[PDB]
Amino acid sequence: KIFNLFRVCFISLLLIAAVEYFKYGTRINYEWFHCTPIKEPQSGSVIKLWARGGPSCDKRGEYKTIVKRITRDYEPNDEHLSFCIIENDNVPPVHYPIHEDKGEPGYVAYVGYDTDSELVQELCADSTIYHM
């Protein structure tokens, strides 16, 4: 009977821990759930990248999604990166509406390798380029 009690308590603790970790991951990684990255390739490796989502896809979620995509879809070890993130200061951090007519993204980034780094430098339009 003691083993059954221990098993039930362990199952309850596992459920509590799983739900707590689910909450923690959703809060920390909400940019994955709410923001869907959008890529608009412009060259062999240069892509104009941003994120789209609902009101919960705030500027923080957009920045997190952009940085995640830049650091995951590109390997600086194989070839050194060159990107820049451009703010859209004309919109609030909660600009995105619930409906499909999202509008201009709050954060937009151009990322590409160093062979075509000239195109990235010319597309940033005086924005600081963060080599990686």
């Binding site: 059954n4 509590i16 959703t26 809060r27 909400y30 609902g54 919960s56 619930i98």
Partner: protein, 302 residues
């Protein structure tokens, strides 16, 4: 004497913990025993308390406390009182013990629940306060203490059920489901907020169970007040577990989306959205259906 006094060891553990906590002059969040003895997470000096891992330690410590209370009440007053009423049947005495313990616990909890509601915007079971303040990250001292104590008591009851100290019981089937759904409901309506939303259900179940246990105890004594007690009990049952629960379900249907904000936002831990409305609706509709089944039992008995 611990073999025939089951509350000696829990009392010793409780008194040791309390003495160790009180003797030290820290008596605040810095003290290690503050995780178990009292509610830990508090934002500044405001009368609002957060959530965290230390709440689970509070739940376990007051699980031990409620084990002590359950054993001690029966051993000191409930059993002598049952003997005093000239009751001799083993089944009668044993069932009266649990019914009177339920009477005491519910007459302490339900009044506490209505007192806690009276000091909030949830009075008269108003459904607007359910979702206007969602998410409810922080809850008042009494609101959190009541919730955590109810969780600890129900977890203690579930642990007793699993321990099968007295396995043969004819009520085990529905009682086990009730305990499981109660633990699930409290835990979900605490970790996933909706803490303000679980209090009215808390109050309805506590008051209905209080009147049910009172009517049951009067029936066991075969007194002349059993019929009147059962009548007021069934009136309160149809008022609380059916009228108020159906009002809450209607709130989940039409007022859940309107009040507060309905867009999902994991960043702000605001889960009141379109994928949580079905979960909250089914998780209370199951309880409402079980209450309807118990109402069928009541009508068959009445």
């Amino acid at each position: 004497i611990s073999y025939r006094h089951a509350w000696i060891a829990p009392l010793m553990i409780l008194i040791a913990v309390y003495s160790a906590y009180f003797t030290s002059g820290n008596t605040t969040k810095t003290n290690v025993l503050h995780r178990f003895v009292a509610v830990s997470y508090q934002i500044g000096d405001t009368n609002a308390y957060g959530k965290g891992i230390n709440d689970l330690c509070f739940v376990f410590y007051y699980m031990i406390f409620f084990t002590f209370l359950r054993e001690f009440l029966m051993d000191v007053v409930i059993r002598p009182f049952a003997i005093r009423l000239h009751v001799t049947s083993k089944h009668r005495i044993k069932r009266i013990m649990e019914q009177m313990y339920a009477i005491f616990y519910t007459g302490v909890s339900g009044p506490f629940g209505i007192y806690c509601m009276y000091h909030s915007d949830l009075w008269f079971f108003n459904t607007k306060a359910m979702y206007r303040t969602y998410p409810d990250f922080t809850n008042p001292f009494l609101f959190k203490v009541f919730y955590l104590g109810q969780a600890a008591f129900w977890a203690q009851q579930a642990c007793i059920l699993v321990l099968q100290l007295e396995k043969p019981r004819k009520d085990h089937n529905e009682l086990t489901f009730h305990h499981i759904v109660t633990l699930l409901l409290i835990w979900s309506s605490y970790v996933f907020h909706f803490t303000k939303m679980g209090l009215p259900i808390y109050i309805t179940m506590d008051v209905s169970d209080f009147l049910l246990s009172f009517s049951k105890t009067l029936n066991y004594l075969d007194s002349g007040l059993a019929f009147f007690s059962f009548a007021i009990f069934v009136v309160a049952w149809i008022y609380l577990r059916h009228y108020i629960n159906l009002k809450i379900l209607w709130s989940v249907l039409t007022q859940f989306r309107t009040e507060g904000n309905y867009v999902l936002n994991f960043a702000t831990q605001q889960y009141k959205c379109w994928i949580s409305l079905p979960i909250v609706f089914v998780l209370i509709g199951a309880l409402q259906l079980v209450n309807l089944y118990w109402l069928f039992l009541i009508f068959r008995v009445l």
